[PDB]
Amino acid sequence: AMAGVFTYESEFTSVIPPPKLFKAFVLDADNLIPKIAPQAVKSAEIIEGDGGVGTIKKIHLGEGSEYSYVKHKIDGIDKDNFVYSYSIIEGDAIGDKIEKISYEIKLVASGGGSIIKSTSHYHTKGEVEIKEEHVKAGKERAAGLFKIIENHLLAHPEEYN
Ligand SMILES: Oc1cc(O)c2c(c1)O[C@H](c1ccc(O)c(O)c1)[C@@H](O)C2
């Protein structure tokens, strides 16, 4: 029956500045990734909402994740300060051990690069197993994807200006 929340903090740098990165990784992620990283993600669609806060999206994952869905709940967007927060509410790692996973992502200017500050909140249930390796994975995973994006924009500077 026991509820809890485990909360983890992570950072990535990028040479791409916030406002470009933001448009690519947040605002256009849904079409972009599927185009440049099919193994990551096949497609993404709005199930519910108006696209703003409170929208839910079914995201169709790629082979990397045995073609499994997740549903994302948009918790907030601030297009000015480059903040985005969304919770995974169904899908891959959302079992019994763990019931929602929530992210706040904050892009910070840093020398015409960015630092991507990421807070994740694993909403637990029952006993709490959290392995230094389960965290390293999920972290590598996210960074793998920012790297795909960063390198994509470096090779396509015509995009997201
Ligand atoms: O290989 C994977 C496995 C996953 O569970 C996920 C992956 C990639 O990336 C998905 C992802 C992450 C950020 C996104 O904007 C996105 O559209 C899709 C993430 O929610 C879940």
mmCIF file of C-alpha atoms and ligand atoms in Angstrom:
data_model
loop_
_atom_site.group_PDB
_atom_site.id
_atom_site.type_symbol
_atom_site.label_atom_id
_atom_site.label_comp_id
_atom_site.label_asym_id
_atom_site.label_seq_id
_atom_site.Cartn_x
_atom_site.Cartn_y
_atom_site.Cartn_z
ATOM 1 C CA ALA A 1 0.000 0.000 0.000
ATOM 2 C CA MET A 2 3.097 2.312 0.778
ATOM 3 C CA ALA A 3 3.442 5.527 -1.332
ATOM 4 C CA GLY A 4 6.553 7.551 -1.796
ATOM 5 C CA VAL A 5 8.483 9.699 -4.269
ATOM 6 C CA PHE A 6 12.117 9.213 -5.164
ATOM 7 C CA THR A 7 13.729 12.192 -6.743
ATOM 8 C CA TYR A 8 16.920 12.312 -8.724
ATOM 9 C CA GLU A 9 18.879 15.187 -10.263
ATOM 10 C CA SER A 10 20.778 15.174 -13.525
ATOM 11 C CA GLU A 11 22.686 17.515 -15.948
ATOM 12 C CA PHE A 12 23.733 17.374 -19.644
ATOM 13 C CA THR A 13 25.580 20.083 -21.424
ATOM 14 C CA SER A 14 24.908 20.984 -25.061
ATOM 15 C CA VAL A 15 26.591 23.383 -27.521
ATOM 16 C CA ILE A 16 23.145 24.369 -28.806
ATOM 17 C CA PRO A 17 21.584 27.428 -27.087
ATOM 18 C CA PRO A 18 18.330 27.243 -25.378
ATOM 19 C CA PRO A 19 15.900 28.746 -27.649
ATOM 20 C CA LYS A 20 16.884 26.521 -30.639
ATOM 21 C CA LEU A 21 17.176 23.379 -28.482
ATOM 22 C CA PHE A 22 13.876 24.124 -26.962
ATOM 23 C CA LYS A 23 12.051 24.339 -30.232
ATOM 24 C CA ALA A 24 13.588 21.032 -31.359
ATOM 25 C CA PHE A 25 13.527 18.900 -28.227
ATOM 26 C CA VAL A 26 10.329 20.204 -26.794
ATOM 27 C CA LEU A 27 8.044 21.896 -29.203
ATOM 28 C CA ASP A 28 8.719 19.665 -32.265
ATOM 29 C CA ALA A 29 9.921 16.492 -30.573
ATOM 30 C CA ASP A 30 6.817 14.585 -31.628
ATOM 31 C CA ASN A 31 7.577 14.774 -35.420
ATOM 32 C CA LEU A 32 11.292 15.326 -35.205
ATOM 33 C CA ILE A 33 12.374 12.266 -33.406
ATOM 34 C CA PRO A 34 10.451 9.814 -35.436
ATOM 35 C CA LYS A 35 12.173 11.295 -38.508
ATOM 36 C CA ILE A 36 15.696 11.321 -37.297
ATOM 37 C CA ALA A 37 15.569 8.420 -34.769
ATOM 38 C CA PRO A 38 13.193 5.727 -35.744
ATOM 39 C CA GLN A 39 14.856 3.197 -33.429
ATOM 40 C CA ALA A 40 14.079 5.449 -30.596
ATOM 41 C CA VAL A 41 10.603 6.431 -31.527
ATOM 42 C CA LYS A 42 8.167 5.470 -34.336
ATOM 43 C CA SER A 43 5.437 8.014 -33.795
ATOM 44 C CA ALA A 44 3.649 10.266 -31.422
ATOM 45 C CA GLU A 45 0.034 11.351 -31.252
ATOM 46 C CA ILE A 46 -2.272 13.378 -29.110
ATOM 47 C CA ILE A 47 -4.858 11.220 -27.448
ATOM 48 C CA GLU A 48 -6.515 13.929 -25.196
ATOM 49 C CA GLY A 49 -6.308 17.646 -24.534
ATOM 50 C CA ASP A 50 -5.866 20.804 -26.645
ATOM 51 C CA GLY A 51 -2.055 20.520 -26.928
ATOM 52 C CA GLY A 52 -1.397 22.705 -23.983
ATOM 53 C CA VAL A 53 -1.017 21.781 -20.414
ATOM 54 C CA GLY A 54 -2.870 18.704 -19.467
ATOM 55 C CA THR A 55 -2.591 17.086 -22.924
ATOM 56 C CA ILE A 56 -1.886 13.402 -23.063
ATOM 57 C CA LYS A 57 0.125 11.838 -25.899
ATOM 58 C CA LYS A 58 0.575 8.219 -26.841
ATOM 59 C CA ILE A 59 4.051 7.736 -27.910
ATOM 60 C CA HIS A 60 4.900 4.790 -29.999
ATOM 61 C CA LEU A 61 8.351 3.613 -29.236
ATOM 62 C CA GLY A 62 10.869 2.050 -31.519
ATOM 63 C CA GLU A 63 12.690 -1.250 -31.640
ATOM 64 C CA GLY A 64 15.032 -0.044 -28.829
ATOM 65 C CA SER A 65 12.073 -0.518 -26.498
ATOM 66 C CA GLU A 66 10.544 -3.622 -28.093
ATOM 67 C CA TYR A 67 7.942 -1.339 -29.807
ATOM 68 C CA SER A 68 6.242 -0.409 -26.558
ATOM 69 C CA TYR A 69 4.078 2.728 -25.816
ATOM 70 C CA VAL A 70 4.252 5.412 -23.203
ATOM 71 C CA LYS A 71 1.711 8.021 -22.449
ATOM 72 C CA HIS A 72 2.980 11.494 -21.625
ATOM 73 C CA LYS A 73 1.000 13.985 -19.641
ATOM 74 C CA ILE A 74 1.978 17.527 -20.249
ATOM 75 C CA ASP A 75 2.324 19.181 -16.796
ATOM 76 C CA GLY A 76 3.684 22.476 -17.948
ATOM 77 C CA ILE A 77 5.417 24.483 -20.642
ATOM 78 C CA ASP A 78 7.036 27.880 -20.249
ATOM 79 C CA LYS A 79 8.301 28.841 -23.700
ATOM 80 C CA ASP A 80 10.114 31.885 -22.385
ATOM 81 C CA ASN A 81 12.169 30.376 -19.705
ATOM 82 C CA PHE A 82 12.648 27.092 -21.473
ATOM 83 C CA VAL A 83 10.934 24.857 -19.048
ATOM 84 C CA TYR A 84 8.979 21.783 -19.776
ATOM 85 C CA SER A 85 7.554 19.208 -17.433
ATOM 86 C CA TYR A 86 5.653 16.071 -18.347
ATOM 87 C CA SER A 87 4.882 12.901 -16.614
ATOM 88 C CA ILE A 88 5.022 9.373 -17.963
ATOM 89 C CA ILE A 89 1.714 7.917 -16.785
ATOM 90 C CA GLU A 90 1.472 4.564 -18.513
ATOM 91 C CA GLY A 91 3.794 2.357 -20.326
ATOM 92 C CA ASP A 92 7.200 1.164 -20.194
ATOM 93 C CA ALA A 93 8.504 1.292 -16.595
ATOM 94 C CA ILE A 94 5.173 1.938 -15.025
ATOM 95 C CA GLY A 95 4.493 -1.236 -13.115
ATOM 96 C CA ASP A 96 3.647 -1.963 -9.525
ATOM 97 C CA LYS A 97 6.977 -0.952 -7.967
ATOM 98 C CA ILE A 98 6.413 2.476 -9.760
ATOM 99 C CA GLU A 99 3.260 4.262 -10.807
ATOM 100 C CA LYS A 100 4.189 7.539 -12.469
ATOM 101 C CA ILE A 101 7.435 9.213 -13.391
ATOM 102 C CA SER A 102 7.584 12.903 -13.631
ATOM 103 C CA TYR A 103 10.101 15.186 -15.213
ATOM 104 C CA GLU A 104 10.924 18.905 -15.002
ATOM 105 C CA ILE A 105 13.427 19.973 -17.650
ATOM 106 C CA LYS A 106 14.999 23.343 -17.559
ATOM 107 C CA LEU A 107 17.346 24.686 -20.219
ATOM 108 C CA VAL A 108 19.854 27.191 -19.070
ATOM 109 C CA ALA A 109 21.976 29.480 -21.078
ATOM 110 C CA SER A 110 25.615 28.813 -20.814
ATOM 111 C CA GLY A 111 28.037 30.527 -23.076
ATOM 112 C CA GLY A 112 25.787 30.302 -26.095
ATOM 113 C CA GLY A 113 25.580 26.663 -25.207
ATOM 114 C CA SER A 114 23.028 25.158 -22.788
ATOM 115 C CA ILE A 115 22.941 23.227 -19.589
ATOM 116 C CA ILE A 116 20.030 20.937 -19.373
ATOM 117 C CA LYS A 117 18.856 20.479 -15.888
ATOM 118 C CA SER A 118 16.696 17.578 -15.334
ATOM 119 C CA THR A 119 14.725 16.587 -12.283
ATOM 120 C CA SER A 120 13.023 13.237 -12.207
ATOM 121 C CA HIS A 121 10.413 12.071 -9.623
ATOM 122 C CA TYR A 122 9.730 8.400 -9.483
ATOM 123 C CA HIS A 123 6.372 8.027 -7.742
ATOM 124 C CA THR A 124 6.821 4.710 -5.847
ATOM 125 C CA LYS A 125 4.429 2.154 -4.388
ATOM 126 C CA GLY A 126 5.510 -0.463 -1.884
ATOM 127 C CA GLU A 127 9.094 -1.435 -1.215
ATOM 128 C CA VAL A 128 11.676 0.652 -2.819
ATOM 129 C CA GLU A 129 14.339 -0.848 -4.955
ATOM 130 C CA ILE A 130 16.381 1.727 -6.722
ATOM 131 C CA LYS A 131 19.635 0.543 -8.178
ATOM 132 C CA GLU A 132 22.669 2.774 -8.983
ATOM 133 C CA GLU A 133 22.517 0.925 -12.403
ATOM 134 C CA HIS A 134 18.763 1.460 -13.096
ATOM 135 C CA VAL A 135 19.568 5.178 -12.760
ATOM 136 C CA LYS A 136 22.729 5.230 -14.902
ATOM 137 C CA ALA A 137 20.592 3.454 -17.635
ATOM 138 C CA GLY A 138 17.706 5.922 -17.703
ATOM 139 C CA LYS A 139 20.325 8.724 -17.686
ATOM 140 C CA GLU A 140 22.362 7.346 -20.580
ATOM 141 C CA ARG A 141 19.107 6.861 -22.405
ATOM 142 C CA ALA A 142 18.110 10.481 -22.105
ATOM 143 C CA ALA A 143 21.562 11.711 -22.962
ATOM 144 C CA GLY A 144 21.667 9.436 -25.927
ATOM 145 C CA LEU A 145 18.648 11.189 -27.236
ATOM 146 C CA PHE A 146 19.880 14.815 -26.563
ATOM 147 C CA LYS A 147 23.053 13.769 -28.385
ATOM 148 C CA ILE A 148 21.045 12.589 -31.370
ATOM 149 C CA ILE A 149 19.245 15.819 -31.437
ATOM 150 C CA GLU A 150 22.311 17.981 -30.844
ATOM 151 C CA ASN A 151 24.157 16.318 -33.682
ATOM 152 C CA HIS A 152 21.204 16.560 -35.897
ATOM 153 C CA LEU A 153 21.015 20.308 -35.436
ATOM 154 C CA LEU A 154 24.712 20.704 -35.935
ATOM 155 C CA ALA A 155 24.376 18.995 -39.256
ATOM 156 C CA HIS A 156 21.212 20.958 -40.188
ATOM 157 C CA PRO A 157 21.733 24.456 -39.124
ATOM 158 C CA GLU A 158 19.059 25.588 -41.445
ATOM 159 C CA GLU A 159 16.598 24.107 -38.863
ATOM 160 C CA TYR A 160 14.950 25.727 -35.856
ATOM 161 C CA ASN A 161 16.161 29.254 -36.038
HETATM 162 O O1 LIG B 1 14.198 3.858 -26.002
HETATM 163 C C1 LIG B 1 13.328 4.651 -25.322
HETATM 164 C C2 LIG B 1 12.536 4.098 -24.319
HETATM 165 C C3 LIG B 1 11.643 4.914 -23.645
HETATM 166 O O2 LIG B 1 10.804 4.450 -22.641
HETATM 167 C C4 LIG B 1 11.545 6.258 -23.973
HETATM 168 C C5 LIG B 1 12.359 6.815 -24.982
HETATM 169 C C6 LIG B 1 13.256 6.010 -25.642
HETATM 170 O O3 LIG B 1 12.307 8.155 -25.293
HETATM 171 C C7 LIG B 1 11.020 8.647 -25.119
HETATM 172 C C8 LIG B 1 10.948 9.965 -25.322
HETATM 173 C C9 LIG B 1 11.607 10.876 -24.471
HETATM 174 C C10 LIG B 1 11.420 12.239 -24.650
HETATM 175 C C11 LIG B 1 10.550 12.621 -25.689
HETATM 176 O O4 LIG B 1 10.228 13.898 -26.037
HETATM 177 C C12 LIG B 1 9.908 11.697 -26.474
HETATM 178 O O5 LIG B 1 9.116 12.307 -27.378
HETATM 179 C C13 LIG B 1 10.101 10.324 -26.325
HETATM 180 C C14 LIG B 1 10.784 8.358 -23.501
HETATM 181 O O6 LIG B 1 9.597 8.907 -22.898
HETATM 182 C C15 LIG B 1 10.613 6.952 -23.215
#
